[PDB]
Amino acid sequence: SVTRVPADVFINSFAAHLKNRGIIKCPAFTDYVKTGVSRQYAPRDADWFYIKAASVIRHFYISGSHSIGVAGLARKYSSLQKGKTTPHHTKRASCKVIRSIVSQFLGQKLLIAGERGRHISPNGRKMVEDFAEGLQK
C-alpha cells in the first residue's frame, strides 16, 4: 500500500502527475499570499500548491472511514510565531487554500462528504494505490 513507500517520493511524484493531468490548477490569489499568520515570507517554489494537494489527499487516505474537517487539517500545517520579544506561541495555518483544494478534489468525485467533514471515496483509493504501486518499482 501507500504506507509501504516513504512519504517523500510519493508526494512529489504524485504532484507532478496531478499537475500534468489537469486535475487541479493554482488560482490567481496564489501569486501573493503566505500559508499562515505564523509564517513571514512567501514560498520560494512556484509549485507549492500541488505539494499541498498531494499531502492532503494522502492524509485523507490514511484516516479512511474517519472524517476530517478543514481546520483539523490546518492544525497539521501549523508553525511558530517569532519576532515579538515575547515567548513564542504556536499558531494555526490558513484555511482558504485548503478549502479550495478540497472543493477541487470533490468536484472530481475523488472525495466524498458525510454527516460532518469529508472522507475518501473508493475511486480515490483506486487511483492513489495504483499510482503508489506504479512507483513502487
Partner: protein
C-alpha cells in the same frame, strides 16, 4: 541559477533611485536597499514583470530594468492589490499610491505640520520627544 560566469553585460554596481546596488546579491534582497521597498513588495513586483527572482542582480539586463520602473509608478494597474501599499486612503485626494525615496521624507514632514497647527496630543509630544503610543516611560529607557 546555473549562472557561473559573469555575463558579457554584467554590471558590477547598479544605481537607481539615487541609491546604489551591488551585483553579487540576489535580486529581491538588493532592492530592499531602497527605502520604500521590502521583501514582500519586491517579489510581487518582479513576478508581474516576468523577471527571475533567484538571480544575481548583476545579470539584470536594462530591458528588464525599465519594465520594472514602469510597475513601481503605476502598480495598481498591473494587478497588485491595495492592502499591499504604503499609503492607503491619502488624507487629501483619498486615493492609494506607493511612495518611494524622497517622497517619504517630504510626506513625513508635512503630517507633523498638519499635526502641529491642529493642536493634538501627538504633535506636542513629538516636539519634546516622548513615547507616542502608550508604552510606559519612567522605568527603564534610561542612560
Amino acid at each position: 541559477m546555473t549562472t557561473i560566469v559573469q555575463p558579457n553585460d554584467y554590471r558590477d554596481l547598479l544605481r537607481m533611485f539615487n541609491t546604489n546596488i551591488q551585483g553579487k546579491v540576489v535580486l529581491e534582497c538588493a532592492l530592499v536597499g531602497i527605502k520604500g521597498i521590502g521583501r514582500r513588495f519586491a517579489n510581487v513586483a518582479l513576478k508581474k514583470a516576468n523577471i527571475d527572482v533567484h538571480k544575481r542582480a548583476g545579470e539584470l539586463t536594462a530591458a528588464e530594468e525599465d519594465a520594472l520602473m514602469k510597475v513601481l509608478e503605476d502598480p495598481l494597474s498591473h494587478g497588485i492589490p491595495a492592502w499591499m501599499l504604503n499609503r492607503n486612503n491619502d488624507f487629501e485626494s483619498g486615493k492609494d499610491m506607493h511612495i518611494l525615496v524622497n517622497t517619504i521624507a517630504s510626506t513625513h514632514r508635512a503630517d507633523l505640520e498638519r499635526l502641529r497647527k491642529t493642536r493634538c496630543e501627538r504633535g506636542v509630544r513629538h516636539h519634546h520627544n516622548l513615547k507616542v503610543r502608550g508604552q510606559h516611560t519612567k522605568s527603564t529607557g534610561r542612560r
